[PDB]
Amino acid sequence: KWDWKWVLGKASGRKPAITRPRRHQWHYCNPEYDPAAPLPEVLRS
RNA sequence: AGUCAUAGGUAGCAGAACGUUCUGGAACAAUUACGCUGAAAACAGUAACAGAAUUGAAGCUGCUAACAUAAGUAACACUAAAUGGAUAACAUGGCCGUAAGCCCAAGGUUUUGCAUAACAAACAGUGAAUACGGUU
Ligand SMILES: [Mg+2]
Ligand SMILES: [Mg+2]
Ligand SMILES: [Mg+2]
Ligand SMILES: [Mg+2]
Numbered sequence A: 001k002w003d004w005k006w007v008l009g010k011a012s013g014r015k016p017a018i019t020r021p022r023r024h025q026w027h028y029c030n031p032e033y034d035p036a037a038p039l040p041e042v043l044r045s
Numbered sequence B: 001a002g003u004c005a006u007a008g009g010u011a012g013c014a015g016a017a018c019g020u021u022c023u024g025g026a027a028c029a030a031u032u033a034c035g036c037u038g039a040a041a042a043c044a045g046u047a048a049c050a051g052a053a054u055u056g057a058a059g060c061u062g063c064u065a066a067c068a069u070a071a072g073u074a075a076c077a078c079u080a081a082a083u084g085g086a087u088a089a090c091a092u093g094g095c096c097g098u099a100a101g102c103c104c105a106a107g108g109u110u111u112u113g114c115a116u117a118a119c120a121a122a123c124a125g126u127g128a129a130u131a132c133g134g135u136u
């Protein structure tokens, strides 16, 4: 559900102009973001 | 056309001229000029006669613009410290660590991402779905 080289900071991400997401934008800056996946109840980091 | 007389000058006064732009007299540079000199000067070598002037500039610590001088001079000394053939990913060393870390506010308003030069800004990027802040 996460791309951990991007999370630790050692890979480029989807939307690479962000570089420091808030609580939301973690879901959409993930390189492994699947649109067909359901959306979680709280949308955490 | 031969004799005589006069000719230092500030302030000031008087007389004679040169030059710039424009106009009148129908039109004086379509096809340029260029023998390099002439004149006492202002100057002349693309009319002349009159007229109208925002009419003459080394000289106002004048204004504007350009270009020099000082001069390749001063400066590139607040800080932690760098090394390996790279402002390196790797390795070694060091500095902060109530900050030189992290999260926001005010303010800024695209300053944010992409190419081992390149033709790349012309292209991208900010998602309210936890009773996030506002609007009340
Ligand atoms: Mg005299
Ligand atoms: Mg005398
Ligand atoms: Mg005439
Ligand atoms: Mg005048």
Ligand SMILES: [Mg+2]
Residues within 6 Å of the ligand: none
């Ligand atoms: Mg030098």
Ligand SMILES: [Mg+2]
Residues within 6 Å of the ligand: none
């Ligand atoms: Mg180095």
Ligand SMILES: [Mg+2]
Residues within 6 Å of the ligand: none
């Ligand atoms: Mg702001």
